[PDB]
């Protein structure tokens with residue numbers, strides 16, 4: 001079945017995301033870390049990014065795939081929120097933010113950048129990382 | 142009109158099955174025409190996608206063609222994203238399927254390049270209108286800022302659970318913090 005193959009690809013895509021956030025972030029401001037995490041998406045293999053978006057499109061017309069993506073996005077956002085709480089205790093970001101919602105909106109900005117066909121060209125401009133820095137630092141402070 | 146009935150049937154078949162699995166044959170049966178009538182209006186599946194992209198582009202341009210008055214520009218952008226989470230879900234699914242097809246089809250990638258450029262040009266014009274009114278910082282790169290705002294919009298558009306997230310007050314407040322941060 002097609003759903004079984006998609007589920008295996010989702011776990012592999014999820015694993016690349018978990019590698020960014022599974023460990024405590026030492027010696028790096030969380031705003032600087034989130035900026036580099038989203039900017040580095042533009043340099044991953046394009047066919048790998050295209051496969052993520054193809055599965056995202058399938059999930060919007062396939063309830064079984066939508067359930068797999070709900071689990072994938074839940075898993076990623078819980079780890080991002082944990083690193084967010086670490087930054088709050090270290091005094092790096094505001095202790096008043098809604099970490100669950102903030103992680104979800106950061107993940108949506110992530111997939112919006114991931115799906116941009118011209119993201120690699122935009123990343124060559126200095127205003128690309130600065131604009132992301134202003135968006136990311138804005139919601140975290 | 143026959144061209145509209147074709148597009149409506151194509152939007153239904155494309156959204157439910159995707160670009161690859163959709164057939165021109167099934168589109169013909171949906172609106173009760175022959176393949177020759179369909180070919181006369183749209184010669185290929187890519188020609189259909191081109192017309193659908195223009196329909197979606199016009200919905201975006203409908204939000205930014207006229208000047209924004211009575212509401213702050215930051216809140217207008219946030220309201221536009223919030224309202225998008227309430228649109229027909231099959232319509233959102235088609236936008237993402239076209240974006241997915243554009244990453245594997247250079248014909249569609251060229252169409253999306255024109256659509257996204259046209260949208261950011263209108264958003265940037267409203268950005269300059271907001272700069273003259275003192276609502277936005279005057280020192281922003283309007284071109285890059287518009288594209289990043291469009292990417293955040295498509296990320297929310299592609300979130301299957303976006304309408305559930307919109308039920309909470311922290312959703313719009315988080316968007317205001319993001320959009321207010323870059324502007």
Ligand SMILES: O=C(O)[C@H]1O[C@@H](Oc2ccc([N+](=O)[O-])cc2)[C@H](O)[C@@H](O)[C@@H]1O
Nearest residue numbers: 013014016017020037038052106107110
């Ligand atoms: O989930 C995914 O499919 C993608 O996640 C990416 O890592 C993340 C970066 C930032 C955020 N965020 O700002 O939320 C979440 C995850 C991987 O680099 C990518 O290879 C993978 O395809």
Ligand SMILES: O=C(O)[C@H]1O[C@@H](Oc2ccc([N+](=O)[O-])cc2)[C@H](O)[C@@H](O)[C@@H]1O
Nearest residue numbers: 197200201204221222225236290291294
């Ligand atoms: O482009 C598109 O396909 C979609 O655009 C949406 O309108 C926008 C809203 C906010 C922003 N923004 O904040 O950059 C840009 C455009 C339409 O409601 C939607 O029907 C259409 O499918």
